Design a binder for these strands. Structure first.
Ligand SMILES: [Zn+2]
Lengths: 325, 178, 213, 135, 82
RNA sequence: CAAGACGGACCAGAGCGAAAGCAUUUGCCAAGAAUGUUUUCAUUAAUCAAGAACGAAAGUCGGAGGUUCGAAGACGAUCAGAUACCGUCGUAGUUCCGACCAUAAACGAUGCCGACCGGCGAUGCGGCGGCGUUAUUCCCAUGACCCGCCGGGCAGCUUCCGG
């Protein structure tokens, strides 16, 4: 039972199920949540820290660089993989696990990548969210040593090698489906769903492609055969001359380019909380807006705000009295 | 069992999807209601169940999702599931003055102000949330606060400059035992 | 001082046999006071009943207006008087970047009912379309509208009221119009939006018994 | 006094809540709409013209009509919300919202909510001038 | 820009340009030899014909006028002449 | 049931027109830009004193009509001095038909015609080239989409062209 930091984040109190509860010091010392650290000082201390012998750390690295998951994982994730590999080696025979992982098979379909399949509340033609389902909805849910890995790249390389992986649910996981991003310029895949520029070529060209791995060791990857996805409509537009100084917003063309700091005031990026027990004594139903700072005058916005505006293509007609900051 | 259905327009589908967990968690936890999103009919469907604590929880959930779909922040409509004297009155801009074209456009502009400042300042005085859909104005707050907000907004879209409206709205707030 | 609800009486109002659910509900009438009868006080009451309250499997945005036409001893036999969409559905279908195509026909059934049919359709954005707007041209709109009138008039003038109202429950006319208009401009959400009574025939008793059972 | 129905099936009425810009009406009636059961406007509760339109008077009227319905035996209500319409404002005020909320609170089963407001196809001239209206 | 052989444009460049805006004007039309499926008679039809050209020995329509190029009837064959 | 009005949402920096202007279906009537053309005439053209046609709203003469709104006007409220604001009512008007009137922030506060001087992709119409998807896998052309080009349009963005 090797606990990833996802188990500690999720407060998965599964120490009673297993007895081989082991983990790295690095994964538990990197957590920045206060409630998790408070919960760490309360829990019964049966977990033990170790560091794997570095030889299996190499071996895990040479097949992760072959399975297409090496840029996605962290060093600590390689530590978790090496620790569960060594605990498998010490407890169970080593002939069970296989190397040189199997080639992916390709099968495309017609659905758009943004089709909201596998989102809980949604229903095409019953699928309801009951008070009985909230504890149930975690992920796709289906002997001595297991894992508590929630990142998909972890489960991908584990089920590729053949280690039995389990979840916050006690029963082990048989099937794992998710989404990845693939570049249509250099065809290199990333398991990080947040990232918008490619790791290899650096272009803003990653598009969503679904994957599913079995417990057997098979990875099969579903494309979308929809011509909407690969269409260059608003991709060529003329760009302004590059501007410097404290207030310049260049159009963000490379991943590691340097922006001037334009942060919101602490008053502006505060949202109203109504579940607080001191809310009803508060004067207003809502937090006051910031209209007094310098960033209010400079019209600084939250980075997440104004997203559907960006997906409108620049060579198009906006209304005649609006201005796009 | 009784249910309500709340429509979603096409510009409110993606906000409904990103903010979905923040919608269905307080409805099902603190009110104990069933909820789904019918994609074929494009309706948010809210249904009573065995675990509902009391009557008029489902009306609270309906007002919550309605305020979200009109364009309010999810936190400002969690204010609807919590509080009892919060309503929403809306009107078109041409319900006050017949405006056509660029005049109408300027009306929207001088509701909002530069950077949105005017809007925010009105929200700071009347303690309301205003949302300006395409030609339409929606206010959220208490009853007397909503009528103060309408007075300020209607003065803005029958011509008066924002400075006059600022002074009038602060004076009216002072005389209202605020 | 005197309560007038003691003098009132409760009657059952019932849907005809064309819908699954019969008992659409209850109805007050002040009793007979010699001069005016309790019967003719309720001879012309119109009921806005949604379709989900008449059949279980159908959709609830449609409303049938049923007019009561006889009373049979705490039963009120009702006949079809109209249909319209829910205004929420009407508000939801009118989106911006598309063409609204409306049409209307004054069509007479075989048994003497003169009806006015209104049909609305919307141009459909295609599955690989990138252009924001989905407008039809004026000749395409006229062709679509002409075929809409043709389909409705051909679908009503050859049938009696019972068959027509049985094809207004699932909107067979709508599916026919969606299929037939694809060769001009593909259509998105067509419905017979409204059905009116322009003319009724002379009242008969055996006809209502046929429509009821 | 009322219908002779078992405890299972509900006897529906139709509730016309009309939220004017000076008061609010509550008209419970038959499914046909022809004969009326109860109607309590906002001014039947507050003895001041200023608060005819408040959500408080709307709440009180909702309690009154709900009480009268349990007197005569109506258990469930369909609701038709309404504002003035025509040339004037189309969206119902907080009076109709408060009446709906408090009436749902007071033991009524609620059926379908429908907005029957007079939207014109195309309108006559507005009561205001060209110069504007509402202060 | 600032260096362009105006004298010898590429044939792609000339074929793109409007028929007047070429270095020397040249039409985009042609006289095509049409061949009726029934008879053996060779006929010449202008590619942007405006009339309904009839067969001399069959009285069969060959092409219909359109906004631009005349559309040939189904079954007729043709070759562009010289 | 009737009367007179008005054609919302769809409706856009979309279209059309010389401008004022123009949005319910259908039919008739005569016009019109653009595009296409290896058609015809062959300088017939540009800009225009004088002179003419059209010209929002309001207004004025005759007839018809009056639903809504509503200058004048009547009231009610309001004050050291209020005679405008506000509410209810309401006349001419607002609608039509025939005459007049010829003015607007009648605006791009920007004559018209011709030429040259950077880039870009959206859109409206017409034309051309081309894989594919669709008309329940369309049997052929054809419409709806998709990719590029050309021409005249309504606009936009970008630029240290030069002013
Ligand atoms: Zn790449």
């Amino acid at each position: 039972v090797v606990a990833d930091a996802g188990a500690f984040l999720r407060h998965a109190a599964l120490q009673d199920i297993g007895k081989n509860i082991y983990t790295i010091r690095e994964v538990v010392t990197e957590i920045r949540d206060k409630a998790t650290r408070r919960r760490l000082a309360v829990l019964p201390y049966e977990l033990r820290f170790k560091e794997p012998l570095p030889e299996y750390v190499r071996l895990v690295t040479e097949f992760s660089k072959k399975t297409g998951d090496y840029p996605s994982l962290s060093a600590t994730d390689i530590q978790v993989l090496a620790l569960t590999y060594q605990l498998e080696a010490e407890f169970v025979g080593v002939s069970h696990l296989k190397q040189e992982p199997q080639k992916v098979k390709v099968s495309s379909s017609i659905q758009h990548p943004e089709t909201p399949l596998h989102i809980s509340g949604f229903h095409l033609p019953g699928g309801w969210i009951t008070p009985s389902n909230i504890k149930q909805i975690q992920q796709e849910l289906e002997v001595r040593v297991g894992c508590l890995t929630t990142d998909f790249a972890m489960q991908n390389v584990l089920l590729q090698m053949g280690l039995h992986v389990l979840a916050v649910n006690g029963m082990l996981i048989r099937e794992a489906r998710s989404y990845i991003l693939r570049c249509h310029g250099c065809f290199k895949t990333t398991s990080d769903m947040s990232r918008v520029f490619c790791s290899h070529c650096g272009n803003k060209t990653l598009k969503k492609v679904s994957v599913t791995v079995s417990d057997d060791g098979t990875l099969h990857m579903h494309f979308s055969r929809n011509p909407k996805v690969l269409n260059p409509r608003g991709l060529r537009y003329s760009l302004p001359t590059p501007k410097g100084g404290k207030y310049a917003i260049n159009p963000h063309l490379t991943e590691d380019q340097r922006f001037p700091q334009l942060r919101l005031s602490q008053k502006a990026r505060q949202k109203t909380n109504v579940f607080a027990p001191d809310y009803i004594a508060g004067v207003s139903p809502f937090v006051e807006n910031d209209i007094s700072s310098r960033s209010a005058t400079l019209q600084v916005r939250d980075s997440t705000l104004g997203a559907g505006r960006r997906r409108l293509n620049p060579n198009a007609s906006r209304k005649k009295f609006v201005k796009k900051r | 069992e009784e249910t309500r259905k709340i429509p979603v327009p096409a510009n409110r589908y993606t906000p409904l999807k990103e903010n979905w967990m923040k919608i269905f968690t307080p409805i099902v936890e603190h009110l104990g209601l069933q909820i789904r999103f019918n994609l074929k009919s494009r309706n948010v469907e809210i249904r009573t169940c065995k675990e509902t604590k009391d009557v008029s929880a489902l009306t609270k959930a309906a007002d919550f999702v309605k305020a979200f779909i009109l364009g309010f922040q999810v936190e400002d409509a969690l204010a609807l599931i919590r509080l009892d004297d919060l309503f929403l009155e809306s009107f078109e801009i041409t319900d006050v003055k017949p405006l056509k074209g660029d005049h109408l456009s300027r009306a929207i502009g001088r509701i909002a102000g530069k950077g949105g400042k005017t809007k925010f300042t009105i929200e700071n005085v009347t303690r309301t949330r205003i949302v300006l859909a395409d030609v339409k104005v929606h206010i959220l707050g208490s009853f007397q606060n909503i009528k103060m907000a309408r007075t300020a907004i209607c003065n803005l879209i029958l011509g008066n400059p924002p400075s006059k409206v600022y002074g009038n709205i602060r004076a009216v707030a002072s005389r209202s035992a605020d | 001082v005197v309560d007038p609800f003691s003098k009132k009486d409760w009657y059952d109002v019932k849907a005809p046999a064309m819908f699954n659910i019969r008992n659409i509900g209850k109805t007050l009438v002040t009793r007979t006071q010699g001069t005016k009868i309790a019967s003719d006080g309720l001879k012309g009451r119109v009921f806005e009943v949604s379709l989900a309250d008449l059949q279980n499997d159908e959709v609830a945005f449609r409303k049938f207006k049923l007019i009561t036409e006889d009373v049979q001893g705490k039963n009120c036999l009702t006949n079809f008087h109209g249909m319209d969409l829910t205004r929420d559905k009407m508000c939801s279908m009118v989106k911006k970047w598309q063409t609204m195509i409306e049409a209307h026909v004054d069509v007479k059934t075989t048994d003497g009912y003169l009806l006015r049919l209104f049909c609305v359709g919307f141009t459909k954005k295609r599955n690989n379309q990138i252009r924001k707007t989905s407008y039809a041209q004026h000749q395409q709109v006229r062709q679509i509208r002409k075929k809409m009138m043709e389909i409705m008039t051909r679908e009503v003038q050859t049938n009696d009221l019972k068959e027509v109202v049985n094809k207004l429950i699932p909107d067979s006319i709508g599916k026919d119009i969606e299929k037939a208009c694809q060769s001009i401009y593909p259509l998105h959400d067509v419905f017979v939006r409204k059905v009116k009574m322009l003319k009724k025939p002379k009242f008969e008793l055996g006809k209502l018994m046929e429509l009821h059972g | 006094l009322g219908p002779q129905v078992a405890e299972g099936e509900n006897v529906f009425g139709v509730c016309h809540i009309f939220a004017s810009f000076n008061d609010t009406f509550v008209h419970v009636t038959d499914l046909s709409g022809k004969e009326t059961i109860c109607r309590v406007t906002g001014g039947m509760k507050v003895k001041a013209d200023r608060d005819e339109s408040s959500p408080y008077a709307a709440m009180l009227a909702a309690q009154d009509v709900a009480q009268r319905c349990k007197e005569l035996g109506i258990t469930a209500l369909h609701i038709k919300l309404r504002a003035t319409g025509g040339n004037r404002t189309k969206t119902p005020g907080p009076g109709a919202q408060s009446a709906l909320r408090a009436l749902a609170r007071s033991g009524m089963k609620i059926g379908r909510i429908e907005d029957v407001t007079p939207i014109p196809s195309d309108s006559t001239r507005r009561k205001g001038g060209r110069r504007g209206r509402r202060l | 820009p600032l260096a362009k052989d105006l004298l010898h444009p590429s044939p792609e460049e000339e074929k793109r340009k409007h028929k007047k805006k070429r270095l020397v004007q040249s039409p985009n039309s042609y006289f095509m030899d049409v061949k009726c499926p029934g008879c053996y008679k060779i006929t010449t039809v202008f590619s942007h014909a405006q009339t309904v050209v009839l067969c001399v020995g069959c009285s069969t329509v060959l092409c219909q006028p359109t906004g631009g190029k005349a559309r040939l009837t189904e079954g007729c064959s043709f070759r562009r002449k010289q």
